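#struct-pred

JT: dropping the chains for the assembly here, can someone run the whole complex?
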Amino acid sequence: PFFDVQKKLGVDLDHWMTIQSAEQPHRIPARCHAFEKEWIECAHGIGSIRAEKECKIEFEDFRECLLRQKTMKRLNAIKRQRDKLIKEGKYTPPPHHSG
Amino acid sequence: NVWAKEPVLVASFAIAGLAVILPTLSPYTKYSLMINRATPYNYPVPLRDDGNMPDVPSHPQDPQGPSLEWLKRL
Amino acid sequence: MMTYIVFILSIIFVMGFVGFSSKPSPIYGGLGLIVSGGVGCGIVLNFGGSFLGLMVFLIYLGGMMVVFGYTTAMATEQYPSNKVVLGTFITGLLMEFLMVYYVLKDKEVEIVFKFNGMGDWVIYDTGDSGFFSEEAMGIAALYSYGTWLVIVTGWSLLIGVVVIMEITRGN
Amino acid sequence: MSLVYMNIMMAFTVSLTGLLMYRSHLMSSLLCLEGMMLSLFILATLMILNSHFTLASMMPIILLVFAACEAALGLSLLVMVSNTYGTDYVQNLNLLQC
Amino acid sequence: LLQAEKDRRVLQMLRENLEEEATIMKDVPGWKVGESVFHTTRWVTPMMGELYGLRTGEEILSSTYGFIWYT
Amino acid sequence: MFMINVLTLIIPILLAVAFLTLVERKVLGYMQFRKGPNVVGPYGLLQPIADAIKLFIKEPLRPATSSISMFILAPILALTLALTMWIPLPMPYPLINMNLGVLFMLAMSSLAVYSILWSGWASNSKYALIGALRAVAQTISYEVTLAIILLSVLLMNGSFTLSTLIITQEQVWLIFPAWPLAMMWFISTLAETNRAPFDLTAGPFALFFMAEYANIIMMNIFTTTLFLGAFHNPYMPELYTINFTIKSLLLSITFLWIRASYPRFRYDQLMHLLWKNFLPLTLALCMWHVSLPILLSSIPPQT
Amino acid sequence: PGIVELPSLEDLKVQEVKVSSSVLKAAAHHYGAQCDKPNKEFMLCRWEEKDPRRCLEEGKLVNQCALEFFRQIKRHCAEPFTEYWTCIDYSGLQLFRRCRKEQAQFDKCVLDKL
Amino acid sequence: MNPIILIIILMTVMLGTIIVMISTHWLLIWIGFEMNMLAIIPIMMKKHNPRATEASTKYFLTQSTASMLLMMAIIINLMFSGQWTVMKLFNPMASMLMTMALAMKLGMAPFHFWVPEVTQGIPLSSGLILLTWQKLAPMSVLYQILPSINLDLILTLSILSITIGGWGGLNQTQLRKIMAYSSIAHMGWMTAVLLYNPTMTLLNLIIYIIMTSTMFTLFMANSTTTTLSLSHTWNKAPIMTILVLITLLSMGGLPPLSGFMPKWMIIQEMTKNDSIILPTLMAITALLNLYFYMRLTYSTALTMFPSTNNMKMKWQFPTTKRMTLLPTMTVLSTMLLPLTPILSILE
Amino acid sequence: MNLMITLLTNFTLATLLVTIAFWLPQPFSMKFFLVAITFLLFDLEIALLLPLPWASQTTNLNTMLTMALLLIFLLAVSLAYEWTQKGLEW
Amino acid sequence: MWFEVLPGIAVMGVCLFIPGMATARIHRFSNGGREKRVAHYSYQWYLMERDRRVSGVNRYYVSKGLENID
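RK: done, full complex below.
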């Protein structure tokens, strides 16, 4: 079983190693701070089932902040398209440093 | 006594015990904590101006805010 | 000498893991794990890596493989290569060659994932005001916030000491 | 997806198969356990660095020191087995049959 | 002051790089020109491939990997 | 220009080591009642040139090896440590300014332990293996002590950059706030260089010899940076380089001078002495150098 | 889904203060004294909205304030301000305890004259 | 062995298991499992025979690779959506690796090859403490992370562990192997109902721990390895025989006796779903693993094997073993039948 | 890669020295094992100690002093235990 | 006497005197009298990057003071 002496004694000795956005020793954020704050406020007073079926949009926003999967997919598609059209030869590219 | 028996151990216990005790009788620990607190890492973030509060000074020259003066004077 | 140096050092890393997972004599195994630890240090220092990758180097390449080679020297003999060892090394090189060939000349290689295949200059910091090398102040916690963690870690090492002496004839 | 993570997970599978299939010496098995340890270390460290997960950046070094003292216990057990026998093979252990 | 110059420079790379993308991708179907992949209406910090993308090697190696092995 | 910097570091190491051989032979000769080597030219600098090129000329040890590649792989590691360990050492401007260098020092000392162990396994039959095994034990027993003491002496300065060390040495020498800790550190440097009064009783003998003496000059330079020295006014580095060279030379002469006149220790006396006398005393100095900067209102400006 | 709303190239033209780093570092404190009063507008904009592409008018304001400040220090005393920052330039990372007497000289110039 | 050192090692076993119970961080759970291993290694090799040495070697290898595969599952969890909260996981692959790690931690059918070998060459006290705390420590974790597990994992391991602890078990007269195969069958039972109502799993954990404590206390009362030694215990004392009768029948689970109560409630809150063929298969195998209990009872207290003299000598000495707590655990373990609505004492 | 350039130059010049030096002229004890494991465990405790000079600038100083003294105190208890209990004797 | 050993130690000390002095000379030569800028933090590297960006020569040593204000 899981017990709750952590809450019972009033010593929150283990809740600070836990998430981001708990106060760092110098007040700096992580890379996805605000996404976490809105996601935690979305799924706080929630029985973890309408958390699964209701906060899905902001959770996917947070996941794609954390890993940046499909944004890299879009950038990689741009890179492959740029490579094949410079292989073609149309507009010897002025996207680098000059016209 | 044991000063002839195992002397480096007794010296280690003595310097150990004074290292335990000596921060209790210390007129400099509050100085240490003020030095350690008064060094900022992040940006000192401003705030929305006033509810006409006699704090949070507008010019950084204004000494109404809490500053450091025991730094320059050792 | 170019951009994908993290990827290339990762290639040498997985080659080193194959090079002692082929089961040689364990002093060759210690050599393979030392080479693998050095290039893993290279990878994490390429991510920077300012403290932790130089920190592992004293422990594994400073304190662990020493005792592994020590115990290789004092316990087992292995006094005289083989078909099975070098054959597994060949098949491991073949599997790495196949995976990296399909990373190179295609889009992505999927075990069950979508590994977006290009070298990682992404992602990285956009030149922030770090000023303290965030690893450094992070590990410069554990003594203000770290009440429980270092206590149970040191307690586990103390119990490790009494365990080792008991099994090696306590008291 | 930060492509290098695929290679380090494949390296984890390399070290895990090297831990599981092992022919003669227990020392190679223990050293591949150490390699698996290094793989988890590096993978989690690159994740925490690119996340700027700066508060709880303790995971690499503390995972390291714990599984290092695990490897120390394994060294002592291998020394005890090699002390009560001649060698430290996987064979000469077929006593105590299941 | 450094913060203001940094913000103007990263928005400069954003504007010029989306202009480059709008010039370069008019062949593929779909493709809205400047969609964040994310959903919330917030300025996310870019990922050093949105800033230093398609700059061909030299500046991105001297920018990302500069401090990492500069002495 | 950077490869020119590297070659101007690692070209004078051969000069330094060979002239250290003549200097140790002459200084032992005058601690004794001997002149010479001085028949081989004036005072014998061509004498280290001559015996170095002689040992290159002389026919190598025939194998008699086990894994030829491993047998060559150990001394190549020893000499590349001896080369790659003068990179962050500041005489006034070091080659690479690092965030941390002292942990790199201790890590490369442990790689020297690897060199000893690999040469010991790949060498020969069982008796030399037992001898090199005891050598690895008596080498590894001191990296506890030296790392502990180096940590407690940098704790007065808080940072690892070591240019902060050359700043913080400006007022007093660091021998005055820590003399016993520095003394025990110097004994640990005698342990790491593996010389008399500590016992060790191969191929290539010249390469193992080279690694030995470059390790000695390394520890002497790191000592001279670490515990003493003087200021450095910029736009004149010759002044600090002169004072640094003179103090490091006096300390290396003192090092060989301490070697010159003491018998070798018993091995169990060596382990007994190290554990039961240096290890509680190092712990005592560590706990006092922890609890003292929180006393005297002086915790360093670790930027 | 939603597309970003980037600012134009018409707002991305401020007279940029293309000055070097050591002179900007040595000219920091009195720039904190006279100017840097209306840029906490910019700081509060940046910390009440986490969204540059919006607070850029105040970025143009701090840009013109810093350029006006360096104009004002350019026209009057000191010209040995140039001597002061080139005294502090070649000293590695710029410690401010390096060239202290000329710091006193520049302070006495700007105090007795401005 | 020093008694101070044994009190310290018991303190560290309790510390590691309480850290597994109480923490909310993943590193702390891994530390608790590792410290449980490190402390439980010198309880084994309490003597210095090579049997305990090889047993501890096998146990250390399997336990350490289970610990590191658990750490692999956690680092996969932070490769995906990353926070150190013991909650729903965020990968079927990570949950798969994690439940297979815990299946190595506590006695499961693909992974049970170390359990009879680790129990055979050790004394009784080490076997008792390893069964109790090494079958208590992962159950808290599985009770935590149940809402993100593919069910076929848990159900396949449960079915196959019940039938392996059944079929393997008809062949050994080594009593430690008998109790180990019984442990495999009951851990299959106690894992089976994890995704339906875990109150049944924890109540079955309580009942199984008390039953195994009674059984091993009865074996520690008179040192036996085989059934013939139990027939000599029949000759020397009669009350141990009726205790072996009652405790073996309560391991068998008969409805007048308290060992039936964990089976019956499992069948109830399993068949309130659409699972019927799976309960009747599990309860047929529960009929199967009673047979070696029954031939053990036939060997001990009901038929009688021929005895050897010097039992005549042992008559002149009354019994002088200390029991830790035998009779309280016995009547708590066997007469607990009309206290079924002490089900809801748990959640 | 700059220190990798230095490492490459040192490694290549060392291999040149070795290969031009070579082309031209033509049981055990438990007491051996206890010291190595004692090294290993005290070295891991050194690894726990050594981020102490990183940490000494925070707003929680008394607690840092207490747990740092606890770490060296535990290390001293381990040392004195194997000292008194014939761990290093001959 | 030890007058006959001081040439050996003298020449070997000169062999140890040379590389740091020549290295510092190459440091001062490779930036035009400047010292090479040390880099340990992201803050110093970003300041160095904007310094070498504003210089026009893409070189961080020119140091462009006060003569591009207005």
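JT: nice. The two ends of chain F are 31 Å apart (CA to CA). Chains F and D do not touch (no CB pair under 8 Å).
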